């Protein structure tokens, strides 16, 4: 599994969350999103294989996943309280972070 697989894992589990009926299902999918975000954060995106590991672009990339993981944790907290609809709405906003921070490097 590489960075592209991790990106598609995020997409598949966002669909799981969208279609979920209860908080347990949302928690499972958020778990897989968090795992894939951690794996992707350690990868070097194609457009940045050029750059040095501490370039402003690579810091952008890794920090986009720090923000994403923190937002996944916020959604997990909602799901852990039984707030299914709140957690699903939070998951929708994970696409805003994913698209704005990370997409420009794939």
Numbering used by the authors: 1 to 106
The authors write:
Eventually, four pairs of BRIL mutants and three pairs of Flavodoxin mutants, together with their WT proteins, were crystallized and structure determined. Compared to WT BRIL, three mutants (T9C-A36C, V16C-A29C, and K27C-A79C) show relatively better or similar diffraction resolution, lower conformational entropy (ΔS) and comparable B-factor. For BRIL proteins, the simulation B-factors are consistent with the experimental values. Based on our algorithm, the best-engineered constructs of BRIL and Flavodoxin show lower entropy and higher diffraction quality than the wild type proteins, and the predicted disulfide bond on GLP-1R facilitated crystallization of the GLP-1R transmembrane domain.
Previous studies showed that proper introduction of disulfide bonds could stabilize the flexible region of target proteins and reduce the conformational entropy by locking the protein into single desired conformation. Here we developed a comprehensive disulfide bond prediction algorithm that not just increased the success rate of predictions but also improved the quality of crystallized target proteins. We applied our method on two proteins which were previously determined to high resolution and frequently used as fusion partners for GPCR crystallization, cytochrome b562 (BRIL) and Flavodoxin, and verified our prediction by solving the crystal structures of the wild type (WT) proteins and mutants. The theoretical and experimental results both indicated that with relatively lower values of conformational entropy, proteins would be more stable and readily crystallized to higher diffraction resolution.
